[PDB]
Amino acid sequence: LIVTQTMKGLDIQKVAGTWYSLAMAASDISLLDAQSAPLRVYVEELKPTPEGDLEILLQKWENDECAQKKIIAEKTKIPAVFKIDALNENKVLVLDTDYKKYLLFCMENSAEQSLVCQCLVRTPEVDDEALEKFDKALKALPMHIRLSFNPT
Amino acid sequence: LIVTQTMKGLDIQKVAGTWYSLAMAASDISLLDAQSAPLRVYVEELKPTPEGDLEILLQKWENDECAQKKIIAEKTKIPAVFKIDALNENKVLVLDTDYKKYLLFCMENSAEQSLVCQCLVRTPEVDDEALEKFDKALKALPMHIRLSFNPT
C-alpha cells in the first residue's frame, strides 16, 4: 500500500486495551482458508510500550485449542506502520481508528501483494459504523475473501 | 450509600474491557493500610456476561507476588448495584462512567459504613478529568485515606 492509505496523526498509546476481531478480509483466499493459516488470527489486546512499539496479543486455532501468541511490532520511520521483525518479515499498518470504538489494520507479507486486514471493535455493540468504515476502506484493495463474525 | 448516588441508566455491556486503577480512597485507614488488606485490589479488566452479571479481574499483592483474582458480581434489582455473593457479602456500586475514559466505583462491606472506592481509567493518559470527577464524587463521603498512583 501507499503512505497515503494509512492513518495520519495516530497516537499509539490510545489504542491500548481490549479489542475484538469482528471482520476479516484478504487478497488471497488461501491466507484465511483454514484456521491453520498463519494470518488467520484474532486480536485480543493491544499493548503499546513506553518506547512506541506495539505488543499484540492474538488467539490462533492450534491443536484443537485456542492458543495465545504474543508478537511485538516495532515502530518504523513511518507513523502508523509497524514491523514484525521475525525470520519471516511482516508489516502492521494502521488504516484508521477513533480509539474508542473501532480500529482498522492490515498485515502485509513484506516482500512487496499479500494482505490480510481486520476490523477491530472495543466491545461487541449493535452499531455497524466499524463494518461500514472497513467496507469503505477495502474498496480500494483487491480482496478475494471476506469474513464477518457473529463474534466468537 | 443511597440509590441517588449511583449511576442512572448504566449500560453494563459498554464497560467491558481493560481498565487501570488510578486512585483509591476508603472510609477507614486500615482498609487500604497494607497490601494484605482484602480491599486493596487493582482492577485489570471488566467482563460483563450475556446475563447482565459482572466478572471482575483484579490483581492483589500475595506472597511477594502479583496474584490474580476473578470475582463475579451478580446483578441485583437496583441498576448500577452488583452483589459479590461470597461467604462475606460485598456490594459493587457504579457511581459514574463515560464508558470510554473513566469509571468510578465503590465496594461496600455489606452489613450496612465501610467503603472503598476507586477511580478507573481506560488508558494511562495525562488528562485529570477522571481524578477531578473522583474528587467531586467523594466530597459527600467520609473518607479517611486517599491514594493516587503514578501508575503501576
Kindly write down the DSSP assignment for every residue of B92-144, as one continuous string. Answer: EEEEEE-SSSEEEEEEEETT---EEEEEEESS--S--HHHHHHHHHTTTS--S
Are the beta carbons of A16 and B17 separated by less than 8 Å? Answer: no
C-beta atoms surrounding A2 within 10 Å: 6
Cell of A61: 486455532
Residue B140 near residue B25, CB atoms below 8 Å: no
State how far the Cα of A17 lies from the Cα of A55, in Å rounded to an integer.
Answer: 11
State how far the Cα of A125 lies from the Cα of B48, in Å rounded to an integer.
Answer: 13
Instruction: Specify burial of residue B150 (Cβ count, 10 A radius: 0-12, 13-18, 19+).
Output: exposed
State how far the Cα of B94 lies from the Cα of A145, in Å rounded to an integer.
Answer: 43
State how far the Cα of A92 lies from the Cα of A105, in Å rounded to an integer.
Answer: 7
User: φ and ψ at A10, to 5 degrees?
Assistant: -65, 135
State how far the Cα of B17 lies from the Cα of A61, in Å rounded to an integer.
Answer: 22
State how far the Cα of B81 lies from the Cα of A138, in Å rounded to an integer.
Answer: 43
List chain B domain ranges.
1-152
Report the amino acid identity of residue A6.
Answer: T
Q: Which of B13, B18, B100 sits opposite A18 (nearest CB)?
A: B18
State how far the Cα of A5 lies from the Cα of A81, in Å rounded to an integer.
Answer: 11
State how far the Cα of A51 lies from the Cα of B84, in Å rounded to an integer.
Answer: 39
Shortest Cα–Cα distance, B112 to chain A (Å): 35
**At A23, which helix (H) or strand (E)?**
strand A20-26
- Helices and strands (H, E) in chain B, number of each type: 1, 10
Q: Where are the alpha helices (H) located in A20-147, listed in sequence order?
A: 129-137
Dihedral over Cα of B61, B66, B69, B75: its sign: positive
State how far the Cα of B10 lies from the Cα of B69, in Å rounded to an integer.
Answer: 25
Are the beta carbons of B13 and A45 separated by less than 8 Å? Answer: no
Cell of B122: 481506560
Q: Which of B16, B17, B123 sits opposite A13 (nearest CB)?
A: B123
State how far the Cα of A122 lies from the Cα of A102, in Å rounded to an integer.
Answer: 6
Q: Does A98 touch chain B (CB under 8 A)?
A: no
| Residue pointed to by grid coordinates 486493596 | B40
Residue A96 near residue A137, CB atoms below 8 Å: yes
Place domain B1-152 in its CATH homologous superfamily. Answer: Calycin beta-barrel core domain (2.40.128.20)
Chain B's closest residue to A44, CA to CA, is B17
- A146-151: list long-range contacts, CB under 8 Å, 24+ apart: A146/A23, A146/A24, A146/A25, A147/A23, A147/A24, A147/A25, A147/A32, A148/A22, A148/A23, A149/A21, A149/A22, A149/A23, A151/A20, A151/A22, A151/A124
Who's near B83: CB < 8 A, 6+ residues apart?
B73, B74, B76, B89, B90, B91, B92, B110
| Residue pointed to by grid coordinates 452479571 | B53
C-beta atoms surrounding B6 within 10 Å: 18
Who's near A118: CB < 8 A, 6+ residues apart?
A21, A22, A23, A24, A25, A43, A104, A105, A106
Instruction: Specify burial of residue B68 (Cβ count, 10 A radius: 0-12, 13-18, 19+).
Output: exposed
Indicate the resolution in Å.
2.0
State how far the Cα of B49 lies from the Cα of B51, in Å rounded to an integer.
Answer: 5
State how far the Cα of A84 lies from the Cα of B99, in Å rounded to an integer.
Answer: 32
Query: Chain centroid to CA A74: how far?
Result: 15
Report the amino acid identity of residue A61.
Answer: W
Are the beta carbons of B18 and A13 separated by less than 8 Å? Answer: no
User: φ and ψ at B29, to 5 degrees?
Assistant: -55, -45
Residue B32 near residue B145, CB atoms below 8 Å: yes
Q: How was this structure determined?
A: X-ray
Are the beta carbons of A18 and B13 separated by less than 8 Å? Answer: no
State how far the Cα of B2 lies from the Cα of B19, in Å rounded to an integer.
Answer: 26
Task: Name which of B43, B97, B122 to mutate to probe chain A: the one with the most chain A Cβ atoms within 10 A of its Cβ.
Answer: B122
Query: Chain centroid to CA A111: how far?
Result: 18
**At A70, which helix (H) or strand (E)?**
strand A65-75
Report the amino acid identity of residue B107.
Answer: M
| Residue pointed to by grid coordinates 494511562 | B124
> How many beta-carbon pairs below 8 A join chains A and B?
29
Residue A121 near residue A133, CB atoms below 8 Å: no
